[PDB]
RNA sequence: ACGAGAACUAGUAAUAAUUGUCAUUUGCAU
């Protein structure tokens, strides 16, 4: 159960509902949308990493 | 399989214009 640090170094856009909305956190929605993503285009297998992980915001 | 994805705060125009470094004052009393 370790937990990740994030530095960014760039400004970001985070966004709600357009695209002159910022926010500063975001939800489990957009991480795990962007770990399958990223699994996809990495082309590995996407069924080990559906159905076990547990992600906080 | 991220309220996403496309998207040059870009294009036009300058320090310009009229102004003199002048106006008087013995290389002079042996």
Known sequence: ??????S????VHFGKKRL???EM???????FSALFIETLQLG????????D???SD
């Open 8 to 11: 960014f170094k760039t400004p």
């Open 25 to 31: 956190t975001i939800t489990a929605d957009t991480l």
């Open 44 to 51: 590995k297998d996407t069924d080990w990493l559906l159905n």
């Open 20 to 22: 002159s909305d910022g």
């Open 1 to 6: 159960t370790k937990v990740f640090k994030l």
């Open 53 to 55: 992980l547990i992600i």
